[PDB]
Amino acid sequence: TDSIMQNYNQLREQVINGDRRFQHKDGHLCFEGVDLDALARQYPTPFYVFSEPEIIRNIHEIQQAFAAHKNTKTFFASKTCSVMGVLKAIRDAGICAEANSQYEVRKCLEIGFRGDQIVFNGVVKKPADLEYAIANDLYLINVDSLYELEHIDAISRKLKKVANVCVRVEPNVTAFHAKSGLDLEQAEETCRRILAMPYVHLRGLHMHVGDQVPESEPFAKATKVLVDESRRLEEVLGIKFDLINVGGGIPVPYKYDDENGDPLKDNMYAGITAQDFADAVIREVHKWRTDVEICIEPGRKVTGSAAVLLTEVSCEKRKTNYDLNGNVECHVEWKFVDAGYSVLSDSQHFDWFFYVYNASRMTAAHDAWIKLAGPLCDGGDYFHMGVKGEEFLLPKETHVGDIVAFLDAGAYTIESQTVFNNRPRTGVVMIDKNGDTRLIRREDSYEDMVKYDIYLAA
Amino acid sequence: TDSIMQNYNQLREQVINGDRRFQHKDGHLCFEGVDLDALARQYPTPFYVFSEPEIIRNIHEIQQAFAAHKNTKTFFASKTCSVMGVLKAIRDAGICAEANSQYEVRKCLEIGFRGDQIVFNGVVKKPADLEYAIANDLYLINVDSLYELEHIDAISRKLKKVANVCVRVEPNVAKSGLDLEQAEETCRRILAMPYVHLRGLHMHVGDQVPESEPFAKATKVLVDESRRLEEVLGIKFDLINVGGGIPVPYKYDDENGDPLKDNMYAGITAQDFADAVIREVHKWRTDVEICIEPGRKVTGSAAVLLTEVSCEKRKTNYDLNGNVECHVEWKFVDAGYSVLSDSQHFDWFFYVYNASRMTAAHDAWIKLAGPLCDGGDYFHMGVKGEEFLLPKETHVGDIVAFLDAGAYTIESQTVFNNRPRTGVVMIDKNGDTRLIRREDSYEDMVKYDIYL
Ligand SMILES: Cc1ncc(COP(=O)(O)O)c(/C=N/[C@H](CCCNC(=N)N)C(=O)O)c1O
Ligand SMILES: Cc1ncc(COP(=O)(O)O)c(/C=N/[C@H](CCCNC(=N)N)C(=O)O)c1O
Ligand code: NA
Numbered sequence A: 001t002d003s004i005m006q007n008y009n010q011l012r013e014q015v016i017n018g019d020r021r022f023q024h025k026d027g028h029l030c031f032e033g034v035d036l037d038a039l040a041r042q043y044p045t046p047f048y049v050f051s052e053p054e055i056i057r058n059i060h061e062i063q064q065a066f067a068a069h070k071n072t073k074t075f076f077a078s079k080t081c082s083v084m085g086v087l088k089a090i091r092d093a094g095i096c097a098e099a100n101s102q103y104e105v106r107k108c109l110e111i112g113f114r115g116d117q118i119v120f121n122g123v124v125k126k127p128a129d130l131e132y133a134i135a136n137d138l139y140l141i142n143v144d145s146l147y148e149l150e151h152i153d154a155i156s157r158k159l160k161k162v163a164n165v166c167v168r169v170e171p172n173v174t175a176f177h178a179k180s181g182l183d184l185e186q187a188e189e190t191c192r193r194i195l196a197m198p199y200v201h202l203r204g205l206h207m208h209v210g211d212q213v214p215e216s217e218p219f220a221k222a223t224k225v226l227v228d229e230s231r232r233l234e235e236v237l238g239i240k241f242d243l244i245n246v247g248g249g250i251p252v253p254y255k256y257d258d259e260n261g262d263p264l265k266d267n268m269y270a271g272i273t274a275q276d277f278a279d280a281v282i283r284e285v286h287k288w289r290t291d292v293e294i295c296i297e298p299g300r301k302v303t304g305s306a307a308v309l310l311t312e313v314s315c316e317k318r319k320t321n322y323d324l325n326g327n328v329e330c331h332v333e334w335k336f337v338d339a340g341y342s343v344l345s346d347s348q349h350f351d352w353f354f355y356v357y358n359a360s361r362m363t364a365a366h367d368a369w370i371k372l373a374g375p376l377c378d379g380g381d382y383f384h385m386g387v388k389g390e391e392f393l394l395p396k397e398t399h400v401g402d403i404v405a406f407l408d409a410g411a412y413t414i415e416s417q418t419v420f421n422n423r424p425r426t427g428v429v430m431i432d433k434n435g436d437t438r439l440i441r442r443e444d445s446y447e448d449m450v451k452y453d454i455y456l457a458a
Numbered sequence B: 001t002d003s004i005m006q007n008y009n010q011l012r013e014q015v016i017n018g019d020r021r022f023q024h025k026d027g028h029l030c031f032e033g034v035d036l037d038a039l040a041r042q043y044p045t046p047f048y049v050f051s052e053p054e055i056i057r058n059i060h061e062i063q064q065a066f067a068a069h070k071n072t073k074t075f076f077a078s079k080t081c082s083v084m085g086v087l088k089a090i091r092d093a094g095i096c097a098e099a100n101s102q103y104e105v106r107k108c109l110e111i112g113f114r115g116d117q118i119v120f121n122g123v124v125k126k127p128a129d130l131e132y133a134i135a136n137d138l139y140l141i142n143v144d145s146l147y148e149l150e151h152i153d154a155i156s157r158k159l160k161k162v163a164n165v166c167v168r169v170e171p172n173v174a175k176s177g178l179d180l181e182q183a184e185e186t187c188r189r190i191l192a193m194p195y196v197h198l199r200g201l202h203m204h205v206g207d208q209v210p211e212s213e214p215f216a217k218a219t220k221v222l223v224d225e226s227r228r229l230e231e232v233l234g235i236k237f238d239l240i241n242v243g244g245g246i247p248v249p250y251k252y253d254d255e256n257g258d259p260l261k262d263n264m265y266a267g268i269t270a271q272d273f274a275d276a277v278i279r280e281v282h283k284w285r286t287d288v289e290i291c292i293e294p295g296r297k298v299t300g301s302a303a304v305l306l307t308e309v310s311c312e313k314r315k316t317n318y319d320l321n322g323n324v325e326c327h328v329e330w331k332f333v334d335a336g337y338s339v340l341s342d343s344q345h346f347d348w349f350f351y352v353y354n355a356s357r358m359t360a361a362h363d364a365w366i367k368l369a370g371p372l373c374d375g376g377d378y379f380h381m382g383v384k385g386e387e388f389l390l391p392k393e394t395h396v397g398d399i400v401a402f403l404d405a406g407a408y409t410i411e412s413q414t415v416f417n418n419r420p421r422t423g424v425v426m427i428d429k430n431g432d433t434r435l436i437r438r439e440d441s442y443e444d445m446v447k448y449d450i451y452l
């Protein structure tokens, strides 16, 4: 325990000393030079702040990782974060976009990605979705089922417009637990049929291994399956594929003290780098072709490390358990923040760990065990992914009005919010390349929330 | 397995032959005389349909349960569902409202609940929230901490307006409430505050509680301490507020269920809840007001999620190596966990039927997936393990129904993958339908962002 506390304050000092994102000023956590205590006095909490410089650094990591293969194309999985200002930053950094719904395709087109910079994935692509995608000449539509393929044939014919497709294959219980992709056994006939379709153009095969995968071997195994079948089909069908699409899954470090962690038992430890992901993928593709295009679809890695959730300590209490004779059994120091699981979904629903610190007292020892609660009704709306069990460490002097920061809060955190208890979804602030801040998403207002309803005011 | 299938089809026939909510017509599931296959051709799926008649039936069950105690006040816990048209139905049915945020208070006031019909609960009530509540003369603010109480004292003094409070106590038979040990001094201090009026004590046991003993024991704790404080402080309390938690049946075949291990079986009824509460309160006072804050029981049974079967596939495991070992039939609906949150995040069971083929045997084992990216976006709370039963005749374009989908299902939606949050339709008391919430539009989604 004392060791756990000691280790946590070693990590705290690494944040403000040797982290490319963070500094401190006046004892306050700073992000790209921006004082986060002061920022949280200018915008109402809770809100997220994103760093454009850190997104750029992440994208460079990915792109540098694939230097051994010139013919690589990188599509940001916009399901990770599709706030328009974030997408615009990713476009400016020079990569492309991946989309999982009609409205995702549309927003990518709106913000400036060309059709030939967009890949459309999904297990459900209704005819209206497919018609929209085909009419906008998307780079790829990644076909997930034979039923969807029938619609692509019929709609491409209606539009007299070529649909460019990959066939998604499940490289692997995966009949019972994997809803996506075709069985490998079905790729050959599926491809044979596409070749014969006048307006469907087979570009390659697709797979996606998973999310936050903390080892290289699954990527290597699955890529080899895809590569072996691509090679075989080239011979059997007498074709040359343009590409292979190996998906996403590059992990992000959510716990940084790798010496104390096992990525195979706790995948908050990232286990591998973008370079290890590239090495595994490229090695398997080059056993087939060095010239073929490799498409990748990273999501999490582009934005995960590039935002902080800022939330104000809004209440406090001590709760005491007594035996049946009025004698203290134990005290619990509860701190309440104005963000709960409706603001940070994965902390609750997917047992996700984020570093928690007192951004107003970043240079103070984090030396008191506390429990950290949200504002929702749910008895379960408190943060259970603690430093030790369900307990967090904050400075003993923590006060109502301090600002708490959750780090590594940029992946899958904005669109997954709700208005449970009619608490609004949060504003979002962006730090640009010059270190200046601006609001890029408003907090939901009272009006915004009732406007969807149809009713007579009393 | 053959017995699980027979039992499920027994339940299916009971839906369309012996359920006050449902009928069949032309092979289709009907809700209060409305053909749901036909309804889902008028509005884009997925969407929720609510029944005002069922809300009324549920409220009647609650109020009848408390007939032995004349002075009972019922507050709908609006966290359960605050679509304005649902709140209006509940207001028009004659009960009161409970709120868990400033904007919930405001929407309750805007739909027509008076201040004296609103209770404000919560572990975080900031000064701005408290000021709004006090200024609007709320019936109760249920005090959760000593920190909050100091703001209430200060703000009520500033406004020169009386704040009506309960003290929430956690009976330790958890983040909310004060310790019982703190009630006496807290009440003593509230009595001395010039603009705070102490109404009583408050508790809330939990959600979907499948047994009466927790309520009886928790109520007795509050009654005993209420009785004691009346003596010690020389006062008569206005009320006792015993909270919510009346369960709703999510599985109906009670003969096959253990509610204490699987709380999708309700275990008790509103009458059992009332009997326990009234039995304890009446050891002390018959004249005192009992406040109750039911949420789930008011609306849970009163909605259906309608979702179109939008894709299908067969996945075949060839021996783990080679040779057909088993086929898995996947059916994809256009609602996933961003539409029906508790099915995923809280392991919640909802009955699933093919509403387009409700009179057909549900004779085929399938797995039921949503449309999201997440490999985990499929429905795992099946009829048998993760498997569901639908007619072998099920086709893309059929309408699947999730029953009992009225509690905690609307405000918990997300726009993950930029799929819109759903529209909501209401069947009114005359059996007519209207849209009471639009589906989010594309324009809705991007309008919150600030961009060029
Ligand atoms: C075809 C495809 N291409 C790329 C990605 C990008 O994955 P990455 O962000 O790099 O881990 C995904 C991701 N899908 C989902 C995320 C789920 C996130 N869920 C969550 N609760 N945060 C999955 O792999 O299950 C995908 O489906
Ligand atoms: C003070 C208070 N008064 C009444 C209720 C109404 O409870 P009822 O709906 O009847 O079970 C609650 C309910 N709060 C929460 C629901 C949580 C629902 N969460 C969900 N994911 N569906 C709780 O008891 O944890 C409450 O906090
Ligand atoms: Na073709």
Ligand code: NA
Pocket (backbone or CB within 6 Å): B190, B191, B192, B193, B194, B195, B196, B197, B198
């Ligand atoms: Na007083």
